[PDB]
Amino acid sequence: KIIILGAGQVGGTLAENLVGENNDITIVDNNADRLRELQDKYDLRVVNGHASHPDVLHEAGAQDADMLVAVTNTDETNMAACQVAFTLFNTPNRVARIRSPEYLAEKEALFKSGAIPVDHLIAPEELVTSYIERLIQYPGALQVVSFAEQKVSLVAVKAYYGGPLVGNALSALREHMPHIDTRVAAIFRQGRPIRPQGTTIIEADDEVFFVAASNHIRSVMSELQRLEKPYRRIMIVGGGNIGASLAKRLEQTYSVKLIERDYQRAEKLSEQLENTIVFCGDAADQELLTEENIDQVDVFIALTNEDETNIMSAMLAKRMGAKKVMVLIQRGAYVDLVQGGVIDVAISPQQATISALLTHVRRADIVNVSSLRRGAAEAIEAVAHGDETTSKVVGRAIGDIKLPPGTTIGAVVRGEEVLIAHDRTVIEQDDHVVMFLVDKKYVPDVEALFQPSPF
Amino acid sequence: KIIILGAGQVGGTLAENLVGENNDITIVDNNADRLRELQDKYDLRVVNGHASHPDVLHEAGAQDADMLVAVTNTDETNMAACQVAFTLFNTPNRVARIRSPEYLAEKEALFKSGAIPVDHLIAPEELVTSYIERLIQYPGALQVVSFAEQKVSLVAVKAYYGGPLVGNALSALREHMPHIDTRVAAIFRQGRPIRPQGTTIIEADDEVFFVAASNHIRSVMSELQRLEKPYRRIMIVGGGNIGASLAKRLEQTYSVKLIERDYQRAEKLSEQLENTIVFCGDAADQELLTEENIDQVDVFIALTNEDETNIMSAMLAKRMGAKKVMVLIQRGAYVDLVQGGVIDVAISPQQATISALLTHVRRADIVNVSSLRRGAAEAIEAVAHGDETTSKVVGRAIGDIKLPPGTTIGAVVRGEEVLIAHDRTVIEQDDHVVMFLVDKKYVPDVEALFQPSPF
Amino acid sequence: QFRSIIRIVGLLLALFSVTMLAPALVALLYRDGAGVPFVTTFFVLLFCGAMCWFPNRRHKSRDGFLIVVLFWTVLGSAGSLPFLIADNPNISVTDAFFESFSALTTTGATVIVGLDELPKAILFYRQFLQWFGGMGIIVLAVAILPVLGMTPRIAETAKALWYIYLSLTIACAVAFWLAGMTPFDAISHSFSTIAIGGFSTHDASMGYFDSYAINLITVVFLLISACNFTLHFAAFASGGVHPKYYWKDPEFRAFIFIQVLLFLVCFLLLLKHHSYTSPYDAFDQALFQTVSISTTAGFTTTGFADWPLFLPVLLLFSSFIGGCAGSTGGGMKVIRILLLTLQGARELKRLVHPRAVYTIKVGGSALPQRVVDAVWGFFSAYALVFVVCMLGLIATGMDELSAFSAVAATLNNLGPGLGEVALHFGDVNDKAKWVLIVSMLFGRLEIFTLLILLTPTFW
Amino acid sequence: QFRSIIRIVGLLLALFSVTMLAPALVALLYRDGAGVPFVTTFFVLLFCGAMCWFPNRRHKSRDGFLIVVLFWTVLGSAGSLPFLIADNPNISVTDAFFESFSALTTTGATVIVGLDELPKAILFYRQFLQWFGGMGIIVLAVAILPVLGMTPRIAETAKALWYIYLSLTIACAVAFWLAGMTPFDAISHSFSTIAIGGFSTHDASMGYFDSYAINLITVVFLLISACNFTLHFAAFASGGVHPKYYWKDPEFRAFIFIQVLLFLVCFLLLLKHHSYTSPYDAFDQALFQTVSISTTAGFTTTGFADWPLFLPVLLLFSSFIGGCAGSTGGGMKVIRILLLTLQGARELKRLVHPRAVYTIKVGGSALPQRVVDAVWGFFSAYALVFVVCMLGLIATGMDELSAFSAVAATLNNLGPGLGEVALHFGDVNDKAKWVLIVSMLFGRLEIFTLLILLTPTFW
Ligand SMILES: Nc1ncnc2c1ncn2[C@@H]1O[C@H](COP(=O)(O)OP(=O)(O)O)[C@@H](O)[C@H]1O
Ligand SMILES: Nc1ncnc2c1ncn2[C@@H]1O[C@H](COP(=O)(O)OP(=O)(O)O)[C@@H](O)[C@H]1O
């Protein structure tokens, strides 16, 4: 039996992908949002009560609980909760999420499990959201998702005017690394998709998707890291616990200007933040952005509390001359909506933790298991279920499958080896197939393609 | 026919004393406060809706309807409010409130021309301050009210250590002005009343009550002004629109220290107020008052929004060494309860205007008409109604009347002349008799004493 | 502030003594029947008022509750005394309290048989009691509304109501005397057709004056008197400002809907059975019996001899949805039923659109949730008082179906109930007669004013 | 997302097709009873389920109303085929719809006379329909709460209820067959005593058996089955955590109060009239008839021949306050009446404390004003549907008093109504028989799911 805790924004996503596979899921939110959300959710039940008192825990604690995921908004309370669980009840393997971050600096003995935390693994919002550094570090990188275990990774890169990808034909990209076996899934240009056969990469908005083994993907990304001139300036409009620590992490390597609306918070930042020019104003007014070289800024990161303020300020910095625009979206309906040409990348803090931690763990298998992103596109990881010829798709060849429109098979994971998809190969039983939709309203049609005749 | 308008900080109180006219009374406040509060604590009429739309006004009648009271917090709205009534509805007797006060500055030339829209009669809620200034002068003058159309005035004075009243026996006070015919009503000492004839005035905060003709009161108060050394130090604990304008009026003649809790308001005061040392702190903490010579201040005025803060801060400044203490009480239940000895005087903005206006208002002649003060004391202006023998009290002498305990008749007004009612009380009296109770729960018995045998 | 009430009680019964003199004078004028008890009662009542008035005291919410309960009870006992003294209706003390309360509490129930051959003083004073308690009803329910389901002058309307209440009884006694009614019976029957009482000087109720015109006049002035008097004030103030200000008030609309529906269903049912040979008769008797019983008046023109048994039961059940909220005489008022309907409709409409803000709008204005909560606290108290009354009557040996009818007749202030206690309450069990008096008192006080007194937390 | 429901309708009547085989198998075992229609209907309904089975929108609010309305209407029309085809009870299409709906909608109403000499297949399928709709009730009302009237799983309780619902029909069929009953009649009468239906294989219902023991067993398992099944879940999970978890639930307390009060008043009244020669018999018949009719079961052991008419009228009126909320049958459940009482009490408690904050507390928890507003929207819908149904039956020429009884019998899902009805619906007007079918449909779905369809705002 698996239990999760807290009202934290992430727990809901941890309560959607994990469902099934012979494990009964329980969520114990805290009182208000937790009651609604708890009521709202598919499958497993929710008891409303503080996540640290033992009485609410006793339902989980001794009745053959599988894994304790204690993810809460507040850290200091979560630690006390994890210890109350361990010392009162067995709770053999537990998880705790603390955005201390100070505690993360010193695991010490408490994270050694003698006292205070008695936890196997700790998940932190801040360092996992510091993958934004990986995004700024790798120029022109919009997204990366992973499939199967760690073997294959899809990547969405952007070709900037003056970059190395503009003008070069796709055949030159394929010939520049003759030892790299990659497969271009699709190319979105001005919002509309394009069929890639050895085309010329238009500078303004081409988005190129790679599907290959992680070793090869990390190698093409390192080569593009070497070729593309690195970013020099960076601008941030949020004073929060994420914005502050991002300014701290970046100030040594880049020239950072940060913006805040709260005078006292701005003062506290200017004290804490050295080498970072900290301002006091709304992220909306142009009279500050233009006055602050908005035409020359490279990356504009929006980390406001409100999503709509992020989206609008960053779309305005994109119009004014910023090269790359990033926002912090806490509403999946928004991230599925604005991460297009105008906004290069939106970072849902829930999916930033979920994708990385969930992908390694358990390699969840379902006829259709999707990785959620933006666009009308979607990237799913179909599993070939059914007997050798009983199933619509098992035993046949990729060129012979009646795939939905826009759907392109990228790679095939066979156990421990990765093969780049081709019409010459034949699908086998229990084979992981990595696919790519251009219009995601055909997600069910692929499920029907892989759903055999019911037994 | 009487109308007043919403919502009214004071207007509600203007709606309780003014209802004594035989002709129809109506009060319409702004919304729920006027109606719900109004219906529950009030008697005959009203009204609804925001001001100053014309739809609410016609309910007043305005068909030679005599009384219009435009109680308003903001002047700019009030002028238009009274104008819509005259033009659309033509109400004849019009009155207005302006705290502009630039308009209050120029209205004597603007409003006394006839061109001005509709509100020749004026009433400012901020000219109560002048009464505070009179209190700061005439040291030891706790209160004065006037009866019989300002013919007779009762005054409550306080005897301070080092003053001219200490040590001197009441006979010496009687001999110091042999041309003044005054009547000592009662003497409150440590809260308990005392029989006053021929007694030595105890220096410690004695309260002495005179009753005399207005000429005699205006002469003895000026004589006490001449003897007692005037006040030189004044401390104020309120930044309010009343406190500010009082500091303005006082700063030129006295050394003023003002206190505020809101830093931005303190800054705005220190800009506006010259010659006034403006502080920033709570009126409660001793660590500021002692540090600021609280033991040496002469007059401590409390003009905070909250009554309880005034009462407590001023009782603390009274304990610490202030000579005279004044507060701003917005609840008559408080002024009737706390203000004796510990708090010398509270400025009810309701009673400050009411006391003068009811006296000027006709006719105020009922079996009992009560002007009320602080404490269990009472000052009434009973009317002796009935023929030579139909009333208990007409034609007979005060020494033969069975007056309630502690009740002392101070003066008797006939026509234009006033008698001090000494001994036999030779009298004409159909005519108005001025009394003084020590316990006001005996007010009805005096009504019963003056109420003739019902037909 | 208990014991400061005695002054008001004394004043009330003193006025009652003057009222008693007026019937006594009528007794002397007609030259029949015992006016001596009336004069004796006047002296006793005035003496009680002075013995109890003693000297007034200081002027000053629970006091108001005590005032109204004392008002109804004391005046009912005062009425009981005149019957107690006289000889022509030789009736037990209980039958006297019953007749006095029912006359005053507007419930048409009676326990004296042989009304025709009775002293014109007594059966005048009965209708006059009905008229008096009629004023008491509308003056309280309109002028004493704190927890008794724009404010103008209290006394000016306290007497404008009396002016309407007299401009009605005059025009109605006049229309009666124009219909061939005896001027005595015309006054005595306007006292009871305007007060919505149900009393008559005859054992046959309105059967004795068997005229189509008298029936139609009773129907008309019953509908007029069942209407909210506050709404008639709009037809009086500043002359006839509108005559169709009525149709805007949705309580009036619900009242006319109920009266028309119940009428035509009773008429069609009275024709399916061929209960009457001439449709002009079925129309008359249906319209009169519906308008009489639904509006809680209590008049009867027939014995239900040929009537199908469904219709008397339907009339008795309809006596729950009585007159309007300001009108004289009622069970649960029609406005509480319009509120019930509106709330059912609201919940229906709020099931289709769950995340929607709907509010009970009556005539354009919204209703505070406290009033709407009080209407259903009243429904609950009504039901749980009805059941206790029925079980009390049954406990005293009264017939069960008859108990349910007597309860629905008294608690509704009807007050003729079908069954064992059909035309006369005289042979009702004595304990059940007291429980009946208690029930009609509950029904006059809107089930709350009295129920509150029984609670220990009150004292 | 209208018109994608047909997939569920097909998948539903396919399950209902599968259910037909068990009564057919019982027909084969006895070998008598003309079981050919059962297999015929099996084929016709499985074919209908296949005819409209195209998956459109599956998954891993306004539609659910049209789901459950078809879960009762469609399934009733499907279950009306066995009666239509068979010959031994040769009954009209209307009588067939009636018997099928009443069997499935748990209302004990019947239109076939001569149940004793009937095919054991058909009168088994009748009790099985009652058992089927019995499961359907608790599976709907507990797991669909748009209209409700620390929190576990939907399916785990959807089957814990099924396990209680089967351990009950077993524990009751066993005691029945132990008290001297055919195992056939024991199953057929536990199918109907647990589902709180009111059906029997005999024209005398539970009067055919004349044993004190079967009466006491029926009383016991009626009280058990009228109780909130969610509360029995506490008696099932982990075993016997308390045996007095029941008495903590104030709904249980109000239910036992009602049953005991109504019992002893019916018993005392059954003794005032000497209706039975032996007080042990008055006790037996009173306890059984109260527990049967008050709990909306519908079983009868006597014809009310010597019973004073008050007792049948009181039982019919008591059928309004039926079973607890989490159980089979009922009209306005007991919890809505406990809420009515509590709100009356609250308005009383406001007697001297106007400024106090009182809240409707049930078992320690407070109720949101939306739920409490819904309970009275339900009271209003009940009343304004009752009146329309009664006027509809009366309009078709049905006897009026009998119409009022048939309405209170069907809307409450009782379903034996006193009067011209008790006990066969044979000679009822045909149009009135359809209006009855509509009313008994209204009884399930708590009068809102169906009423919404008539509303214009829905479409
Ligand atoms: N329009 C805006 N421009 C600049 N900063 C803003 C704007 N709106 C909000 N902020 C700031 O975002 C900062 C940090 O977000 P915060 O509220 O700390 O996030 P959280 O609620 O997760 O703690 C705050 O200082 C807040 O003032
Ligand atoms: N100890 C105190 N507690 C609260 N308020 C204080 C105190 N001392 C000074 N003040 C000030 O009293 C002022 C209120 O003045 P006033 O004009 O009545 O307020 P408003 O304009 O809201 O009426 C505020 O500046 C308030 O901060």
Side-chain angles (χ1 to χ4, degrees), chain B residues 24 39 44-46, chain C residues 150-154:
Chain B
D24 313 354
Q39 290 216 67
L44 281 169
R45 219 72 145 107
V46 129
Chain C
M150 148 55 96
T151 102
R153 330 235 180 167
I154 314 301

Side-chain angles (χ1 to χ4, degrees), chain C residues 340 343 354 370 373 380 400, chain D residues 273 340 343 354 370 373 380:
Chain C
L340 183 69
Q343 223 269 13
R370 194 118 160 177
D373 270 320
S380 196
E400 307 94 23
Chain D
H273 301 104
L340 181 70
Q343 222 267 12
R370 191 118 156 177
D373 271 320
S380 199

Side-chain angles (χ1 to χ4, degrees), chain D residues 420-443:
Chain D
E420 178 187 272
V421 155
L423 193 271
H424 73 72
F425 279 84
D427 286 59
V428 184
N429 182 338
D430 218 1
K431 329 163 60 51
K433 225 171 272 178
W434 283 113
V435 178
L436 282 161
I437 303 194
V438 175
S439 156
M440 51 204 331
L441 273 187
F442 264 140

Side-chain angles (χ1 to χ4, degrees), chain A residues 24-25 44-48, chain D residues 60 150-154 156:
Chain A
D24 254 20
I25 218 166
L44 47 43
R45 81 270 250 156
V46 35
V47 47
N48 64 304
Chain D
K60 176 212 195 321
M150 201 61 80
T151 54
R153 314 183 48 101
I154 306 300
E156 162 196 347

